[PDB]
């Protein structure tokens, strides 16, 4: 049974330095199995630097939960958004490379990211 922390790595982590990326990664990381996710962000940093965010700036998630954290620094990311004619099971993404703060919700001890909220 995949843990939430491991799913976060599968959905959100690609430490390698980076217009088709999103289309290719959403398919290949097996993220479009059940429905098209409307947005999904990949983070191009070490896993450690991402897990570190859980001890950086405590913020509210968009939904109002308060166990979210914003990276003190911006991070290299790819933002993937549904575009054009995307329709399950044929999902379609627009790719945008950026440098933005990430906001994650953290759970557990060890306290690690379990949900990617937004990039700002």
């Amino acid at each position, epitope marked *: 049974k995949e843990t939430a922390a491991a799913k976060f790595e599968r959905q959100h982590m690609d430490s390698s330095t980076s217009s088709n990326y999103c289309n290719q990664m959403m398919k290949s990381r097996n993220l479009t199995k059940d429905r098209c996710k409307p947005v999904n962000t990949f983070v191009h940093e070490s896993l450690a630097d991402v897990q570190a965010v*859980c*001890s950086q*700036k*405590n913020v509210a998630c968009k939904n109002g939960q*308060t*166990n979210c954290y914003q990276s003190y620094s911006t991070m290299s990311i790819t933002d993937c958004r549904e575009t054009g004619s995307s329709k399950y099971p044929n999902c379609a993404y627009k790719t945008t490379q950026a440098n933005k703060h990430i906001i994650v919700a953290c*759970e557990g001890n060890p306290y690690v990211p379990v949900h990617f909220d937004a990039s700002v």
Partner: nanobody
Amino acid sequence: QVQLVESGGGLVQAGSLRLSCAASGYPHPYLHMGWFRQAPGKEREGVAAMDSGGGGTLYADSVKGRFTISRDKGKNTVYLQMDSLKPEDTATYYCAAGGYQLRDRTYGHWGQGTQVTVSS
């Protein structure tokens, strides 16, 4: 410094104690801070938590009317005033910060634990 440090606690009778906890070196507000306990024989449970900006205060049903939580304004310090104490309040108490409401798994930043043993 950055880590939470608890004080107070120990032996008490059916009766009063005041626990305190500070993370003075964490240099932003922790949105939620609160207290959890693990009573002998029982899963850890949240006892009280309070938001930094008016977003809410919460008590476990079993302590309503007996315990009162408070926080310093804009310093990461949280207090638990414990009155009307019962033997079943015996427990290791823990300060927590940076999580949401009374959800143990959402808190990853903890004090060191404080034993409270309530006698007849």
